[PDB]
Design a binder for this molecule. Structure first.
Ligand SMILES: [Zn+2]
Ligand SMILES: [Zn+2]
Lengths: 174, 183
């Protein structure tokens, strides 16, 4: 079972010029408590809040988190949103107002039935030093770097239980 | 409800120097049928297959898709994996072998109970021209750009039913920053 290398290539088309400036801008995750999510993504993971949007009638907010230098954020609001929403590799965290006050409410991480989405993943220079710091800050682990079959690869979870892979691309050939 | 701009900013901390080389490398989605997913992501959305990994004991494959020039892909296998897994903004599609032949099997897109993940999103130069092409390619739409509350933004679905936003960054101020009427 599983596709051959040749079968996978037989399915691939080269990029049409009509797509040439397309970019993979965002992954959207719903978050129960934006106070906990903002602290985790900024203080623990080192992302920057690059844009906040509020929809007061539909009762939700969007938080765009990215690995960007805060000094690169434009000061004028229309330029800032066009900059933020043209960054590659952002996270769009959706806060449905009031979930943080609902003891019975939680989101689903995709890793138990019914499955779909699995994880986001962060590339780091050193999985072990990254994970030592995560452990010092009280991050919950799904998989410590040396636990299980694949040594030197970790999974943490965010405040909603979403899985985050921590990988060092220079060690992955092994 | 919801945080004020000041309250949200106050919940943020400046990035620790130990994180300054971290990058958001991948989003992982499980796919029923890799042939349909590869045709969709390469041909319809214009991504490149940059790495394929097979795990014969665990019976799954990984496909890494990205907006990269195929001429940048190293030929040597270990250099190629290090290159592919150091790209920002990749999609990691996980094929659990045998799903493609199981008429009763489908993955969950996160947009009905139980919710969590919602979508990925593609920034394009022109949502209307992109969507006209998508219509010509028989893409299934969730939301056309001229329907619903958020005009100028589209949602399409991939072969597993995952939602993909189609957005133009230069149209998002009017969509997201303008004063909205109460009825
Ligand atoms: Zn979105
Ligand atoms: Zn992964």
């Amino acid at each position: 079972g599983g596709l051959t290398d040749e079968a996978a290539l037989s399915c691939c088309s080269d990029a049409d010029p009509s797509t040439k400036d397309f970019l993979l801008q965002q992954t959207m995750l719903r978050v129960k408590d934006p106070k906990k999510s903002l602290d985790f993504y900024t203080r623990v993971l080192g992302m920057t809040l690059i844009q906040k949007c509020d929809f007061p009638i539909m009762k939700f907010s969007l938080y765009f988190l990215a690995y960007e230098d805060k000094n690169d954020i434009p000061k004028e609001k229309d330029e800032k949103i066009a900059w933020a929403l043209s960054r590659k590799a952002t996270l769009e965290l959706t806060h449905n107002w009031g979930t943080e006050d609902d003891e019975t409410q939680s989101y689903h991480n995709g890793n138990s039935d019914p499955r779909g989405f699995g994880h986001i993943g962060i590339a780091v220079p050193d999985v072990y030093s990254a994970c030592k710091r995560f452990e010092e800050l009280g991050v919950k682990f799904v998989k410590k770097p040396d636990d299980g079959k694949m040594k030197g690869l970790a999974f943490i979870q965010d405040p909603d239980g979403y899985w985050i892979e921590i990988l060092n691309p220079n060690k992955m050939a092994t």
